[PDB]
């Protein structure tokens, strides 16, 4: 019988979390990778795309 | 994750990997640490030799905060200083550093390793060993006792 003291969550190291966020921002700046995720950006000019 | 467990590979086999002739029964040798000294003797003796019996005096109410004492050797003693600060003392020759190790969490200075030749240093602490104090004296330093 299922119990409520099954270990539901996990603990994650802080440095690995930060590293992953950093590596995920960097991937947001490559045109090829963004296209391969399913976004239709064939008419964009720059992939970082800063706006005023 | 149940996806990767070993029991799923035996799922069409009869005995689940435990054997036709010797079954998987429940406690066929005792419970916990049961048979030590009778029929588990060989395991106990070759893996945990000094297990049985008692030796020594009793100490009835310990209070471990009375004897707490972390230590440090003389090797790590110039390394408590920043490198640019370490550079300045090795250049000038009429000044020496005075280091208080209790402010860093150490209580007793211990005497393994080699201090730099002809580089005086003054060290404050609560306890010293004989060899450490001799090594500090030899290069031209001094030990100081604090409380």
């Amino acid at each position: 019988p299922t119990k409520i003291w099954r270990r539901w969550g996990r603990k994650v190291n802080l440095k690995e979390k930060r590293y992953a966020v950093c590596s995920s921002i960097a991937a947001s700046g490559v045109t090829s990778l963004v296209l391969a995720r399913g976004h239709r950006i064939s008419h964009l000019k720059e992939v970082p795309l800063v706006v005023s | 994750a149940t996806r990767f467990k070993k029991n799923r590979k035996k799922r069409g086999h009869v005995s689940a990997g435990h054997g036709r002739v010797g079954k998987h029964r429940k406690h066929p040798g005792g419970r916990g640490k049961a048979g030590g000294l009778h029929h588990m003797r060989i395991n106990f003796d070759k893996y945990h030799p000094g297990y049985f019996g008692k030796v020594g005096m009793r100490h009835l109410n310990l209070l471990k905060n009375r004897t707490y004492c972390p230590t440090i050797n003389v090797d790590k003693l110039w390394g408590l200083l920043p490198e640019e600060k370490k550079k300045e003392f090795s250049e000038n020759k009429d000044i020496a550093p005075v280091i208080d190790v209790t402010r860093k969490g150490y209580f007793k200075v211990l005497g393994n390793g080699k201090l730099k030749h002809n580089q005086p240093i003054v060290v404050k602490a609560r306890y010293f060993s004989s060899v450490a104090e001799k090594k500090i004296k030899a290069v031209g330093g001094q030990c100081i006792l604090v409380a």
């Binding site: 003291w5 | 395991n43 009375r66 550093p97 005075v98 208080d100 010293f128 001094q142 030990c143």
Partner: protein, 211 residues
């Protein structure tokens, strides 16, 4: 047991399932606690919800170099600031009737703390627009202009926190001042070898003084 393993030790032999407790609401409860102590502040109407505590040392050779907050000033420390134990309670000042001052350093430290606190508060009259002197060491009341122009500042809560240690761990000395004829290890060992008879002589001094 059969392998090179540590010998088992688990203390699960009673009915352990009846009391197991999983903590599903730790962050919910801290949100609730934060909201309650925030609600108290709006009910105070300007006065802080914290109280002043002294600075004391920790009791053991493991911690004696550290300080922290204690539960209240002593009678002598309050009299050094011209305050009374009863009147002080009506301000955010804690009183401890059983701590003692064995040295001068703690006395002066806590007296300076009390004096600094007593200089940085403005008193609001009991009945509006009726300003009177203090009593029992309480400062005199303030006028409405100062009350108006201090209600718009930010209250300082840093006076309620323990002091922070800034003592350095190295220094510089001149080579000509180093002492060379000092023996630390020998002194340490002769100090231990001498204690028992010195205790005996102190006890005999005590006997002589009593009579």
């Amino acid at each position: 047991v059969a392998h090179n393993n540590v010998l088992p030790n688990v203390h699960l032999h009673k009915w352990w399932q009846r009391h197991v407790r999983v903590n599903f609401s730790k962050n919910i409860k801290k949100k609730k606690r934060r909201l309650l102590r925030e609600k108290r502040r709006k009910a105070n109407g300007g006065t802080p919800i914290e109280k002043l505590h002294p600075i004391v040392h920790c009791p053991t050779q493991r911690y004696n170099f550290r300080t922290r907050l204690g539960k209240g000033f002593t009678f002598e420390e309050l009299k050094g600031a011209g305050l009374t134990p009863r009147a002080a309670q009506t301000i955010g000042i804690c009183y401890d009737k059983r701590r003692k001052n064995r040295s001068e350093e703690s006395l002066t430290k806590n007296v300076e703390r009390l004096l600094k606190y007593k200089n940085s508060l403005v008193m609001i009259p009991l009945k509006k627009n009726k300003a009177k002197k203090g009593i029992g060491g309480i400062p005199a009341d303030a006028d409405k202009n100062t009350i108006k122009e201090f209600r718009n500042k930010k209250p300082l809560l840093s006076i309620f926190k323990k002091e922070k240690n800034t003592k350095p761990f190295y220094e510089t000395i001149e080579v000509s001042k180093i002492d060379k004829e000092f023996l630390a290890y020998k002194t340490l060992r002769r100090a231990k070898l001498a204690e028992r008879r010195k205790n005996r002589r102190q006890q005999k001094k005590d006997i002589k003084f009593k009579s």
